Symmetry: D2
Subunit: 253 residues, 4 copies
């Protein structure tokens, strides 16, 4: 029987690339999304045309709130409902925007979005993933981290806090879930897919910083590291975060 | 004239030792507390006996909520009101307890609010208010030398402390142009929990390479005092372990 | 045509498993060895039985000395002479023994030479020679140590060598990126234990490992090397992959 | 009676400021030097003018060789000869120059000088320091590290290797010497005193990168962190490396 994977924020960009590569490797996939319903359905249609009944979509907001735990339980339940199992969880979904310390979202919304998506939802999804594992096995979680966590973007404190918290989770969860045979790793992009609304000049400013090829990672390149970590070739690997950054983090100011 | 400092969770233990040393150094102090009003006032009385009108108290819950930003704004405002200035912020207050990932009291979302609130969100909001309201200005965040070798089933706590490292670095960068330095002190084992039994205490003590004992609260405060001093005027984004080598010790 | 790899200290244990997995992946291999000539030759015979003319052996001492740069140049040259190319270098060979700060036959300068030479200087000189011969998926993989920041008592020179190797991995990734040469690391925690180590001591190490209370096989370490030299790692440079079963996360 | 300190490479620059500040704190000092004999003797003169018989010079090459252990032993011996005790060792002396990987001194002498000064000499000095401790007391070692070790300068491999090895030594020696009450820490400058050979435009380019003040650290600012680490206010601190970098290491490419 084919294993099954949940990928959060999988409608487009890195999340889609991960869903696609997992699908190509023989996984059934839950394509979680928030707003990008058309994109998500379009992806699921493509994947189901390749192999029938191997992809479903699952809508949820991952902003922190008192219902977030129920929402995360439901995402995992959706994988079991569709496929009867849940072998892999990929925490990809992420809010990303500045929160300057000095000067229409309230600061409490910002906290709920940036810390919820990047850290609390991963934690709750990890809880639910583990709790459901009830009656060979290759169970794992991959968290999408950030190679620049220690050289952060100016004015991105809450975003960076959430990514740092995700490193914490990756390590704490690896330790705690090891006895259940669930590995927990991370993949840390440098610059991959630039924002759709970023101008070309600004894109190039980033590209030129990258030692290896002076270009951003393809979405596939990021997906490759994920696929490695979920594979049998990584069965002794847990609590590791693999940078996929073309040397960007090694470059001084 | 004298500089002024805010210390969160200053009524007891490490926070109390920090407030005391900052006061001995010549600071006026705001002693923040949540539940420990008696101890907060007793400390303020002691410091005020030494130098009149140099210590005040400030109550607040630092759990994340809809009202936390206003609470944090008021803590900073209390310092300006009492003393006309705020030169130093010490983010010491902290919730600490386990949050197992798997189940065999508090809801998980209350746990998130308390652990991520006290250890990360409140420090962020306080940092915001401190900066907005502005010489040797600095912030010191009480971190945790064991962040990368965490205690089993403490994922939320550890996440909060990791977030606090991120805040420390991000705020150091962003606040450098304003001349506000932002650093951390990372204890290993200092004052053991009051509810911990003596046998467990000795088990932790024996792990510590340097003297096989826990750090006094004074020894933690010493690192804080260095970081806020003129001797650290070029230091920002730095986290000083004060752990007697505990973090270097393998399983 | 088939790519070629140099693996240092490839006669036995982890280096052997790396050489074998590379071979299985389609590489021709230079099996470097110091003292284990019989094991090196037996491996080369095995590999050439599988595919003729796909394995050769290369003897060299990688202790630091005046002649080490020449020795390292010759190891790289051996790959070119045998196979006409050198696509992968794996820096695996390593001296490992205690060097207490306060006090067997060795002088301290010999201990420096052996520990810093094998773990850091020889990898640097090999990296220089590898790069200089580059006139495509070229990469270098350094065998690091996941416990580099929680070191074993009285292993200062060893640990200094392994820290130096992290610095090399990073510096060489940056410098060699314009040549399209990737440089990465694999950091085992506990993998193959010494055969003579008593089982009681072995089991002490095993029980520390969160994931399965066992050491890594050599093959598991090799798997990470194979990923890093592959087309699935084309954007990965300056990264050190821990393969430690969570051992480095475990507090004292 | 007064404690005694050895500072390597103490004739000029950072090492000189360290020796001066230790002396102002009440230490007697061994001013180690290699080529800067005139400056070393001058500094000893100034300190002895302040308090007679509180400073001596000690000449040594700290390049790696078969005689390096003897030379290191002799430095420590010189502190005991002069002052009857050795409480503090500051490993400051450092060779610093590029060693490109792709194509003066032979590569073997570059290894000897860069790895010798930055790593092997510290190690041998640490051995000799610990061994000589015959046996209020506040023994410690401070290693001058580099805040940019993970964001190194292009074509400085051997230098960066030596400084990485020095981090390892700091950690290993902290662990091993803790039972003897010897603390072992580091101070990691970012940009402090710029090379005398560096041109003015280039100096200003480095200054511009520093978030805190857009200026290099003074030697006295670096010495202040050393003074802290050797003091009674750092009694529980061992195996710690304190960055003194004005935020430079936090700044992305
Ligand atoms: N792109 C890069 O260069 C880069 C660099 C470093 C790290 N990363 C990390 O890699 C991952 C993927 O990056 P990316 O650029 O592909 O991500 P992205 O496009 O910025 O966001 C991915 C998805 O996150 C989902 N999301 C945002 N807010 C959400 C919410 N409140 N609830 C539920 N889902 C929400 C969105 O889903 P809908 O569209 O369905 O609303 C969105 O499509 C992220 O974790 C990111 O931080 C990326
Ligand atoms: N003790 C150690 O060995 C150790 C080790 C590593 C790190 N640290 C860090 O060092 C700092 C001091 O440690 P400690 O042991 O002295 O701390 P602690 O006694 O556990 O807590 C200090 C204070 O935090 C305040 N606090 C807790 N929850 C709060 C809330 N919801 N709102 C506002 N305040 C709240 C409490 O104030 P009230 O009493 O007034 O309610 C408490 O007295 C903490 O940041 C801690 O994580 C300590
Ligand atoms: N095994 C582990 O648990 C573990 C843990 C952490 C890191 N690692 C790292 O992983 C790598 C493989 O480990 P391993 O246990 O397989 O290594 P190992 O058996 O201790 O040594 C590998 C080979 O290194 C070669 N070597 C030693 N001294 C040499 C010298 N002077 N010149 C040339 N070669 C020399 C020897 O070759 P000859 O036999 O031909 O003389 C030896 O067989 C090493 O880099 C090690 O540090 C291993
Ligand atoms: N300056 C910076 O911005 C900066 C940045 C990061 C880290 N650091 C570190 O801080 C420390 C001090 O920096 P600095 O700039 O003051 O150093 P420096 O001027 O470059 O060198 C200090 C001294 O090292 C001695 N030295 C060089 N080679 C030697 C050898 N072969 N044997 C014995 N001694 C030798 C020289 O003594 P003689 O003059 O007597 O020959 C020299 O004066 C160094 O460890 C450096 O790596 C400095
Ligand atoms: N860290 C990220 C990045 C992105 S878009 C990638 C990017 C944005 C700005 C500058 C350079 C590259 N989206 C998320 N959710 N998280
Ligand atoms: N990290 C901490 C510790 C403490 S109590 C110290 C302690 C607890 C458990 C084992 C050893 C030592 N309080 C807070 N807020 N944060
Ligand atoms: N880190 C190593 C280990 C070994 S032998 C394996 C071993 C593992 C655990 C304890 C003692 C011995 N060889 C090298 N070169 N490097
Ligand atoms: N790391 C160092 C630096 C220096 S001179 C300071 C400098 C050099 C290059 C760029 C900017 C500043 N000397 C030694 N021994 N070690």
């Amino acid at each position: 029987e084919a294993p099954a994977a949940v990928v959060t924020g999988a409608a487009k960009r890195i999340g889609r690339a991960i869903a696609v590569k997992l699908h190509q490797t023989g996984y059934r996939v839950v394509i979680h999304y928030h707003n990008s319903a058309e994109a998500a359905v379009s992806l699921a249609d493509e994947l189901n045309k390749e192999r029938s009944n191997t992809a479903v979509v699952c809508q949820a907001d991952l902003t922190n709130s008192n219902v977030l735990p129920a929402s995360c339980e439901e995402i995992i339940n959706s994988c079991f409902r569709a496929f009867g199992r849940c072998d892999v969880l990929v925490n990809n979904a992420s809010a990303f925007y500045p929160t300057p310390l000095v000067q229409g979202k309230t600061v409490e919304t910002q906290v709920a979005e940036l810390i919820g998506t990047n850290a609390i939802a991963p934690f709750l999804l990890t809880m639910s993933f583990a709790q459901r594992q009830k009656g060979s096995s290759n169970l794992s979680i991959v968290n999408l981290c950030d190679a620049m966590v220690d050289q952060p973007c100016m004015a991105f404190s809450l975003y960076n806090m959430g990514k740092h918290a995700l490193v914490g989770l990756t390590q704490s969860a690896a330790l705690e879930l090891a006895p259940y045979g669930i590995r927990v790793n991370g993949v840390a992009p440098g610059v991959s897919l630039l924002p759709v609304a970023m101008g070309e000049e600004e894109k190039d400013k980033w590209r030129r910083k990258v030692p290896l090829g002076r270009r951003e990672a393809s979405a596939e390149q990021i997906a490759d590291a994920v696929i490695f970590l979920v594979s049998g070739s990584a069965q002794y690997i847990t609590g590791s975060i693999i940078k996929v950054d073309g040397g960007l983090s090694l470059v001084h100011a």
